[PDB]
């Protein structure tokens, strides 16, 4: 009798608002431009599936359309917040070794998980044998870099889809976004761009978790009286 | 149970169908969130293929009217002595200053590029800018 | 009156720079591995330059130095490849230290 009311007031309520967590304020097109998010790879490195997101080529250097990045980033951050609000396990995956230390700190700070090391075969499709029969897999996987160190899609992109795990991913002009659920076209090389992504995803997760505590507390205080 | 056929549909299409058929007893945590705020493109696997024959990419080269001026300036004077500071978003280079003056003199109503180019250089020289030609 | 992305791109310092070949820019040594100096000049990728012998001691993390850009990204396509091989690095020549 009380479970249905609890679920409706807490779990179903946030799903009725377009921007329950107000992630719009976290970023603007100006802030993205100042972080060099629009700088893509050379035209010769272009992936065919990234053409819809490319504004053009400036002297053989693809320019990512930041007007699409804003709408794509808005949806990715919204989905990330809703999953953190629902107490979902978020895993950060990246094989760029220049940012392995940064990403591992960002995950520990927001109370989430990071996998920045060599991805051993079967971590997701063979987890019950690797970790244990009662291991719980991630509910969301955020790819800060979707390519491995031989410029091919990170294996977890395919394995996450096999396990029916939604994925958020920063896809540069040489990446394949076909299997990424919430692709965000943007530069994944510049430290300024990567630092901005880390701040944005860390803030959305922290905000969502705090909102969950505030909503639960109010529901409990009102329940007693 | 789940379906590991990542090449058939999307995670939502597969999950939704299995929940409907009764194979999945409880829909996953992300299912309700996905349906409320779905992405612009459904994540369906698609194979990249090489462009053959006359097929070409729709990406177009980014050009501007002032690129004609910038190209000419760089040929006549070369890279300015002032080093480009790309960290400052409002940084204006010697070439950019030339384009600005060139455009200002274009508003006056000059129709000759060569004459307008000469007048632009003279205005900068009067302002104290160092314009050492390659010659 | 919100600035559109196209407006930002047209007036960006990188756009007005045009071709990067033989353009003097100012970088910052953000990471140092032995003599190898990793310099950021505001592009997509950094440039790696060897510590000059004349005044190697002066080059430290954060020092601003003058570069001559050759390429924003070192890429090339080799026999039988479907896409360019990319070094994920820029080509530049370290001229000296920037002094105000």
């Amino acid at each position: 009798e009380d479970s249905t009311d609890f679920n409706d007031k807490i779990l179903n309520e946030p799903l009725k608002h377009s921007d329950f967590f107000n992630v719009k304020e976290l970023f603007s097109v100006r802030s993205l431009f100042d972080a060099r998010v629009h700088l893509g790879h050379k035209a010769g490195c272009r992936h065919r599936f990234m053409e819809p997101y490319i504004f053009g080529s400036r002297l053989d250097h693809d320019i990512i359309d930041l007007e699409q990045t804003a709408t794509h980033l808005q949806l990715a951050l919204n989905f990330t917040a809703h999953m953190a609000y629902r107490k979902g396990i978020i895993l950060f995956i990246s094989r760029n070794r220049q940012f392995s230390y940064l990403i591992e700190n960002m995950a520990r700070d927001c109370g989430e998980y990071a996998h920045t090391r060599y991805f051993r075969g079967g971590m997701l499709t063979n987890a019950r044998l690797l970790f244990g029969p009662t291991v719980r897999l991630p509910d969301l996987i955020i790819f800060l870099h979707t390519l491995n160190n031989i410029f091919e899609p990170h294996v977890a992109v395919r394995d996450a889809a096999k396990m029916n795990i939604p994925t958020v991913g920063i896809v540069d002009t040489n990446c394949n976004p076909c299997l990424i659920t919430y692709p965000v076209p943007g530069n994944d090389d510049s430290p300024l761009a990567v630092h901005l992504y880390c701040r944005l995803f860390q803030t959305a997760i922290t905000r969502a978790k705090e909102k969950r505590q505030q909503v639960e507390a109010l529901y409990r205080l009102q329940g007693q009286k | 149970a789940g379906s590991r056929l990542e090449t058939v549909g999307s995670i939502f299409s597969r999950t939704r169908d299995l929940v409907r058929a009764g194979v999945l007893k409880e829909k996953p945590l992300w299912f309700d969130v996905y349906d409320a705020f779905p992405p612009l493109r459904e994540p369906v696997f698609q194979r990249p293929r090489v462009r053959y024959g006359k097929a070409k990419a729709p990406i177009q080269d980014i050009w501007y009217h002032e690129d004609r001026i910038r190209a000419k300036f760089y040929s006549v004077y070369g890279s300015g002595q002032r080093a480009f500071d790309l960290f400052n978003p409002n940084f204006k280079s010697t070439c950019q200053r030339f384009v600005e003056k060139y455009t200002e003199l274009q508003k006056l109503g000059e129709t000759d590029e060569e004459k307008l180019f000469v007048e632009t250089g003279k205005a900068l020289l009067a302002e104290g800018v160092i314009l050492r030609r390659v010659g | 009156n919100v600035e559109s992305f196209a407006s930002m791109l047209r007036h960006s310092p990188l756009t007005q720079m045009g071709p990067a070949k033989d353009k003097l820019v100012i970088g910052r040594i953000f990471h140092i591995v032995e003599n190898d100096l990793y310099i950021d000049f505001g592009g997509k990728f950094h440039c790696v330059c060897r510590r000059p012998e004349v005044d190697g001691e002066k080059y430290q993390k954060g020092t601003r130095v003058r570069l001559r850009l050759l390429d924003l990204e070192l890429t090339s396509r080799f026999l039988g490849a479907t896409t360019d091989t990319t070094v994920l690095e820029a080509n530049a020549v370290l001229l000296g230290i920037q002094e105000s």
């Binding site: - | 050009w63 690129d67 760089y74 | 196209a6 407006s7």
Partner: peptide
Amino acid sequence: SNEDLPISMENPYKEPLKKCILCGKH
């Protein structure tokens, strides 16, 4: 609409074609 959109031109920075030392000499 907007005037800052890229326009269609031929590469103005394109360098002239190279020539062999004997180009134009009988």
